[PDB]
Amino acid sequence: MEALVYTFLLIGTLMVIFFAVFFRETPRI
Amino acid sequence: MEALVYTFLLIGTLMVIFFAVFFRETPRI
Amino acid sequence: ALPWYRVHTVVLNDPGRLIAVHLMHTALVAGWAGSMALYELAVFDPSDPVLNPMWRQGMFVMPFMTRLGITDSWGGWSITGESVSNPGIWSFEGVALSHIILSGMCFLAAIWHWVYWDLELFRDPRTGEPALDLPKIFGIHLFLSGLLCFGFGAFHVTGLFGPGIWVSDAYGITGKVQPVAPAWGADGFNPFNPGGIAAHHIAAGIFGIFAGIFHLTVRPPQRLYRALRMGNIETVLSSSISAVFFAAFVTSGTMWYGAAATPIELFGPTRYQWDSGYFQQEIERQVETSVSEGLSESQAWSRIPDKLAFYDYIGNNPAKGGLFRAGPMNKGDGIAEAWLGHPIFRDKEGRELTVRRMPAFFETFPVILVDKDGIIRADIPFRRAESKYSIEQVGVTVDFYGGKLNGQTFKDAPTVKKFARKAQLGEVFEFDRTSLESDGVFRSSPRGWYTYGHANFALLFFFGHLWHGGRTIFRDVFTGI
Amino acid sequence: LTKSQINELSYLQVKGTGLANRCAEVVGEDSIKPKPGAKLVDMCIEPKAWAVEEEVGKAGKTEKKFVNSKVMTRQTYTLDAIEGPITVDGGKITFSEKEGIDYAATTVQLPGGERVPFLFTVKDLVAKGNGDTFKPGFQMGGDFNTPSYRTGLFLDPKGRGGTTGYDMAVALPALQLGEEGDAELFGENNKVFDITQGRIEMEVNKVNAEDSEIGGVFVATQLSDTDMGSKTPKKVLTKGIFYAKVEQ
Amino acid sequence: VSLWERFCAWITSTENRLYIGWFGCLMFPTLLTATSCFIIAFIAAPPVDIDGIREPVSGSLLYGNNIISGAVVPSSNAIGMHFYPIWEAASVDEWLYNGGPYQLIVLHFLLGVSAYMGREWELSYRLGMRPWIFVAFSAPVAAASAVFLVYPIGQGSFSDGMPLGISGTFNFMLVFQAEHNILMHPFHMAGVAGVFGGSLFSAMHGSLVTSSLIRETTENESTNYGYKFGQEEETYNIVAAHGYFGRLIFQYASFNNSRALHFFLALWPVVGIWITAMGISTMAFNLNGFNFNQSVVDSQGRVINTWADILNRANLGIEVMHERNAHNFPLDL
Amino acid sequence: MLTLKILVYTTVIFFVSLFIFGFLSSDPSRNPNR
Amino acid sequence: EVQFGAYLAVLLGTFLPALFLVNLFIQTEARKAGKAGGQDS
Amino acid sequence: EVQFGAYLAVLLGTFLPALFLVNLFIQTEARKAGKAGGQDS
Amino acid sequence: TGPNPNKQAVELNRTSLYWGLLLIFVLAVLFSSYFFN
Amino acid sequence: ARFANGKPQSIEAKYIMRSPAEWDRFMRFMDRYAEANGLGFSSXXXXXXX
Amino acid sequence: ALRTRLGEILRPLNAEYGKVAPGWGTTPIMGIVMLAFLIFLVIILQIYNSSLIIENVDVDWANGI
Ligand code: CLA
Ligand SMILES: CCCCCCCCCCCCCCCC(=O)OC[C@H](COP(=O)(O)OC[C@@H](O)CO)OC(=O)CCCCCCCCCCCCCCC
Ligand SMILES: CC1=C(/C=C/C(C)=C/C=C/C(C)=C/C=C/C=C(C)/C=C/C=C(C)/C=C/C2=C(C)CCCC2(C)C)C(C)(C)CCC1
Ligand SMILES: [Fe+2]
């Protein structure tokens, strides 16, 4: 049953990575 | 072990009640 | 404006709100103490204080209560085995409830001090701005703490007007709370001499009282005032952190190595009891004297108390558990039932083979039998192909003395191997592996847990002191070069 | 106070006072020398102290010791109005209890919160005195049996009993419908009723001859209650005083 | 200026966050001790014998109960109506074995609610308003007294009072039905009518008032934000609400004097609850509801069952089972 | 347990006398209008 | 005895909505403070 | 097999700090929006 | 009593939010198995 | 318990100590109210005169 | 601001602030005391370490009871 927890944690980390690339603060000069 | 959960829930409800009496929005006219 | 790690700096120049925040912290600490005591009382089992002591059940707060004199409980039982009739308010439950009430009152006081922050007391008449005379506040608080230390030493330890402290035997068989007379000599600095505690507290009291009077009267010199920045509260913070991690290191060391303030019966045996064969040597000496006075070997071994034999077991070694093996020791082996008796290994020529006990480092150790001169005589072969020392080739027998198996002997091959493997690690005991679903793995003492937590906290607080002292010294530049 | 003093008091003066449990004292040590065929018309057995056999460690060693315990039931324990025929087989006084209020439900609480109910009874007693005349220094002794604390008509919280009630745990129907159904539960579904044994030792003290009354001190050890065979019973030790009047 | 005067003044002050008053001197300590004992007992009270047959019943959280099954078990049947304070027991353990905390909590709670009524009146007097809110609060107080004190008095034992818990409350209600036939009592009918009517009138009054609310807000802002505390004009249109109500049912049938409307709102549930508390009080002395058992008989004489006979059947089923071990004789007197 | 009875008997008479003498201290005069 | 999945259900259902509501209140107050000029930006 | 208390530890230690950080960010953005005049108050 | 002159605000960038979320999730990933044991 | 009892004083100590609380109250009340004999207001619940 | 009764009592304790003695004050006594404390600490440490053996002081478990 802990396989579900491990999978959830890994997918959540991947989603966080996804949001940090395509939804980042645009740096302006 | 669920006695701990029940006690925590009851004490948390009591604390919420405490904060709603002495930390309320003061109604002004 | 303020980054998340800098959020608590608003209370830097609001003497009033500081008090409120320190009071909130005090309330949290007291509430934790009370709630932890209540939980431990809920899960405690005061049935057998011989083979199921407090340290065996994972109690962390109970030893500190029992050290200072709290033994009775409202349930009618006593930690020293006896029964108590009508204990007073100062039982385990009374202490827990008192702490919870203190937490609540501190919470209310914190609220009041946060709301009424602008008190004229925290103002400087000369300038009109909030300010604290730190060299004078220090004198006041140090004088108070010296008075408290002297009172505790003279009245609550010497038993003049107090219960006393926990005092035990050299082997932790008969220990109880009693007043301790101070030792005003070189032996007062013996860490294992309980009179040293009373002597220290009385002398350090009479010393800190005079220090506090001095600080109340005498003003600082200008050179020190400018050098130490004795007008900035953060230098107080850094120095206090320094003292705190110094104290944490000292306490962790004294618990790991043992002292009069960390008795065996409360926190369990130390690591170094097992290395030097402390209890094993004591057991051998007692058996030798019982044989010398004239008695059968079986009855000589049957006079050894079960507590003494239980100390000589590797499951009670604090340096044996793991970091993530949670729970009490009973979760590791089960609740100890009874002593199985001391086995004696003999071979065909009637020698006395002894099983080499495993050291604390190893987790798997081979079963090896050696004679009185340390020469291999038998073992359990890993590869039984050309083994010349197997337990079957060299006939070896066991004869249990003084226990559940007292007077019994075994000549069979598999049973001798079973008992050799059992006796490879300390004495042999009977455990209940079903009450808590005990798995097959050891666990650590409250001694080890306290030492680990406090050593790590001290190591972190050294860094905290470094950072804060550096921030005090570089205050003007701490915004940009 | 003695029976001659309690008989002066009216019922209104006694109610509530709590002396209904107390046993009348006897004064004026003397010898009765009972006539054969006489019997004890009244007999009050009052326990003054209760203890339960328990295991406790003194200095690292555990041994069977009787630990004290406070009684939870208020003022019920005392027995009274026990009657029995005194006989002389070989010049020895034998009480032989026959009838009277001799059982008394009692609950006592051990240190640690343990509650031990037991039936304090003197049934089928057979005393064997150390002579004849009930005279200062006499001893009786004897053995007795203790009936079941709960009779057949008692029902468990789930509705199971011996003479009446469900034979199984109706709350759990999945335990049925399986070849070997409720078995682990057979130990609790089956209600057994067994009689125990108790040993009492009575020593006589000051004996009045004019009023034909005897008083003294007893020591009794009775087997505790077993919850219809669900739990192993405990051992209860009791000591106190007594009083009895012999009619000739 | 004396000390007594100064005190009396602080006590009757109307500028304290919570009004103390002279009734507060009875309400505060009593309610506080009642709630402290209740909280402790709900967590760690040992089992108590309630039927006085040496069969203790557990009601504490630490004894394998949950919030619903847990309760404060009433005192033992052996005590009956006798006063059982702490100091009359020989030990605190024995006091807990016979259910003393129930008596303590219930007596303190009753004194506290009476003092609460008094304090409501006292503040009404201090603020210069019309003094009849505590008359309205009398109905719950009367109900609580009937269920906690009057019924044990009539039955003759504190073991017959309502246990302080959920499942205990349900058990009390079921046993009351079995032994007394509460449903067929006209006062319980009046109480059900009062409670249903109170809910009906509350819902309808709220709907009528909120529906006719003067437009003083946008759509992206809570309608409640249109009203400002301390207004001088009505935020709702009585005319529109009365028009809707009259068109809904009938023209004659309708309230206009909003004062009469609010008086009726106060009157209905209060009189309902008073009548119900009187039902409980009357039935505490064994004046049960209607017994229409075997009332219908055919020509021959055989009995024809009605819906009341099935109620009697259910009552028999409950009755022969409640307190299974307590009874020794055929009648329940 | 006689001490506990003594302490409670005090608390009770304490608060009851507080009540009785608080309502005897010209309470009807205490009122918005004068 | 009891189900060991309830723990997660009870604790998550207590904490997550509570933190959601606390979040709503905190952001409302922060926006209100930002609207009015003062020491808070 | 595994400890049934970890579930609570892992899940609470994942969710509570995450919601705390999300709260901080949301209130920062709300204050920023409140400071600048516009449709948001 | 009064308006405290020491009350400041609190800020957190979105990059700080991403760093914090990543740290929390990675710590959970690292320690989950050890907690489960 | 059920021993009837004048009030519920069982020990002279209990009566002699339920005494000082009431007498303490009488004294604090007398502190304000002393040397009062007349001043009849003759009005509906006035008691205006102190 | 909000003079409280307590505040009135505790005012003299916080009255003087920033007062200081000029010219090294009593620093040499602080040096003496710090050095003697260092000597005491090394004495204690070496006794506990069994690196300093003194008559009548055996660093071992003893029978207080
Ligand atoms: C009336 C006050 C009071 C009393 C009597 C107690 C009593 C007790 N507390 Mg306690 N506590 C209190 C207030 C009090 N507490 C408050 C206010 C808090 C909140 C901060 C706590 C938080 C607390 C915790 C968290 C714990 C206790 C525990 C205990 C028990 C063991 C005490 C012990 O071992 O201390 C040991 C004390 C020390 C080791 C302090 C050492 C002092 C240091 C070394 C001072 C060094 C610096 C000093 C300034 C040097 C200069 C002076 C010198 C020159 C003379 C005992 C029943 C323990 C327990 O068993 O829980 C039930 C426990 O774990 N308490
Ligand atoms: C009772 C307990 C209740 C729960 C409380 C506990 C929750 C508290 C948790 C807060 C900690 C948050 C720290 C994040 C907040 C955060 O990081 O903010 C980043 C922050 C940005 O600093 P600035 O001053 O630029 O930011 C100011 C504002 O933007 C934010 O205040 O920098 C720091 O805080 C310095 C620390 C850098 C630390 C870098 C961490 C990244 C480590 C690597 C991550 C793993 C990579 C794995 C690769 C293998
Ligand atoms: C108000 C009031 C009251 C009440 C009170 C109360 C009820 C209290 C409680 C309290 C409490 C109940 C508290 C608690 C606390 C707790 C705590 C404070 C905890 C903490 C913890 C921590 C912090 C930990 C951490 C950690 C982790 C998690 C992991 C590992 C590591 C560590 C250990 C670090 C009274 C009535 C008295 C009076 C009046 C008023
Ligand atoms: Fe209205």
SS (H, E, C) chain K: CCCCHHHHHHHHHHHCCCCCECCCCCHHHHHHHHHHHHHHHHHHHHHHCCCCCCCCCCCCCCCCC
Residue D25 DSSP class:
P
Selection from C41, C164, C29 nearest residue C92 by Cα: C41
Q: Vertex D213, ends D210 and D215: CA angle to 5°?
A: 135
With b meaning 16 or more CB within 10 Å and e meaning fewer, what string describes K7-28? beeeeeebeebeebeeeebeee
The total number of residues shown for chain C amounts to 481
Measured in angstroms, the CA of H41 and the nearest CA of chain A are apart by 23
Place of tokens 């030798």: C288
**What torsion do the CA atoms of E51, E52, E54, E56 make, to the nearest 10 degrees?**
50
Residue C70 DSSP class:
-
Q: Cβ of C296: how many Cβ atoms within 10 Å? A: 13
Q: Vertex D196, ends D195 and D197: CA angle to 5°?
A: 135
Q: State the burial class of residue C102 (Cβ atoms within 10 Å of its Cβ: 0-12, 13-18, 19+).
A: middle
Q: Report yes or no: D169 and D175 within 8 Å, Cβ to Cβ.
A: yes
Chain CA centroid to CA E34, Å: 17
**What torsion do the CA atoms of C293, C299, C302, C305 make, to the nearest 10 degrees?**
-30
Number of inter-chain CB pairs under 8 A, B vs G = 7
Measured in angstroms, the CA of B11 and the nearest CA of chain E are apart by 10
Query: Alpha-carbon distance C14 to C121, whole Å?
Result: 12
Q: Tell me, what amino acid is at I15?
A: T
The total number of residues shown for chain J amounts to 50
Q: Tell me, what amino acid is at H40?
A: D
Q: State the burial class of residue C145 (Cβ atoms within 10 Å of its Cβ: 0-12, 13-18, 19+).
A: middle
With b meaning 16 or more CB within 10 Å and e meaning fewer, what string describes E39-49? eebbbbbbbbb
Q: How many CA atoms lie within 13 A of E13 on its CB side?
A: 10
Q: Cβ of E319: how many Cβ atoms within 10 Å? A: 15
Long-range contacts formed by J27-35: CB under 8 A, 24+ apart: J28/E3, J28/E4, J28/E7, J28/F21, J29/E4, J29/F21, J29/F24, J29/F25, J31/E2, J31/E3, J31/E4, J32/E2, J32/E4, J32/E5, J32/F25, J33/F25
Nearest-by-CA chain J residue for E80: J2
Name the closest-CA residue to atom 7, ligand 1.
Answer: C95
C335 bridge partner residues: C432
Method: cryo-EM
Query: Alpha-carbon distance E34 to E102, whole Å?
Result: 10
C165 bridge partner residues: C178
Q: What resolution does the deposited structure have, in angstroms?
A: 2.9
Q: Nearest 5°: phi and psi at C406?
A: -60, 130
Selection from D145, D224, D231 nearest residue D191 by Cα: D231
Residues with CB under 6 A from ligand 2: C 3-5; H 16-17, 20; I 11-13, 16, 19-20, 22-23, 26
To the nearest 5 percent, what fractions of chain E are helix, strand and coil?
Answer: 60, 5, 40
* End-to-end CA separation in angstroms for chain J: 46
> Helix, strand, or coil here: C346?
strand
Selection from D26, D2, D24, D30 nearest residue D134 by Cα: D30
Considering Cα of E35, then E38, then E40, then E42, what sign does the dihedral take? negative
Residue C87 DSSP class:
-
Tell me the ligand closest to C243's alpha carbon: 1
Query: Alpha-carbon distance E278 to E177, whole Å?
Result: 16
Token readout for E175 is 């046993």
Q: Nearest 5°: phi and psi at D217?
A: -125, 135
Q: Report yes or no: D201 and D141 within 8 Å, Cβ to Cβ.
A: yes
Query: Alpha-carbon distance D85 to D127, whole Å?
Result: 11
Q: Report yes or no: D168 and D162 within 8 Å, Cβ to Cβ.
A: no
User: Relative to the CA of B11, which ligand 3 atom is closest?
Assistant: 7
Query: Alpha-carbon distance C213 to C140, whole Å?
Result: 8
Q: How many CA atoms lie within 13 A of D5 on its CB side?
A: 10
Number of inter-chain CB pairs under 8 A, E vs F = 39
Which positions ≥6 away from C7 have C-beta within 8 Å? I10
Residue K42 sits at the chain C interface (C-beta within 8 Å): no
Query: Alpha-carbon distance E42 to E67, whole Å?
Result: 9
Name the closest-CA residue to atom 2, ligand 3.
Answer: C104
Q: Report yes or no: E122 and F27 within 8 Å, Cβ to Cβ.
A: no
Residue C10 DSSP class:
G
C-beta atoms of B7 and E61 within 8 A: yes
Selection from C137, C134, C132 nearest residue C14 by Cα: C132
Query: Alpha-carbon distance E114 to D221, whole Å?
Result: 54
Query: Alpha-carbon distance D92 to A25, whole Å?
Result: 109
Residue A3 sits at the chain I interface (C-beta within 8 Å): no
Place of tokens 């009267």: C217
- Substitution target from H10, H25, H28 for chain A, most A beta carbons within 10 A: H10
Which positions ≥6 away from D138 have C-beta within 8 Å? D93, D129, D130, D131, D203, D204, D207, D214, D216
Considering Cα of E134, then E137, then E139, then E141, what sign does the dihedral take? negative
Q: How far is CA H34 from CA C2, G34, H29, H38, in A?
A: 18, 5, 9, 8
Which positions ≥6 away from E131 have C-beta within 8 Å? E121, E124, E125
- Per the rule left: phi > 0, alpha: psi between -120 and 50, beta: everything else, D96 is left
Which positions ≥6 away from E2 have C-beta within 8 Å? J31, J32
Query: Alpha-carbon distance E225 to H15, whole Å?
Result: 35
User: Relative to the CA of C35, which ligand 3 atom is closest?
Assistant: 12
Residue ranges of E 11-70 with Cβ closer than 8 A to chain F = 11-12, 22-23, 25-26, 29
Selection from E166, E40, E203, D10 nearest residue C101 by Cα: E40
Strands D99-101, D80-85: parallel, antiparallel or unpaired by DSSP?
antiparallel
Q: Cβ of E264: how many Cβ atoms within 10 Å? A: 11
Q: Cβ of G32: how many Cβ atoms within 10 Å? A: 14
Q: How many CA atoms lie within 13 A of E144 on its CB side?
A: 16
Q: How far is CA E24 from CA D65, E114, E115, I34, in A?
A: 55, 11, 7, 57
Query: Alpha-carbon distance C75 to K46, whole Å?
Result: 46
Selection from B5, D109, D49 nearest residue E47 by Cα: D109
Query: Alpha-carbon distance H33 to G30, whole Å?
Result: 10
Query: Alpha-carbon distance E320 to E333, whole Å?
Result: 14
Q: How far is CA G18 from CA G12, H24, I25, in A?
A: 10, 15, 21
Q: Tell me, what amino acid is at E219?
A: E
**What torsion do the CA atoms of K18, K22, K28, K33 make, to the nearest 10 degrees?**
-20
Element spanning H6, H or E:
helix H6-35
Measured in angstroms, the CA of E229 and the nearest CA of chain B are apart by 5
Centroid of ligand 1 to alpha carbon of C98 (angstroms): 13
C-beta atoms of I29 and A13 within 8 A: yes
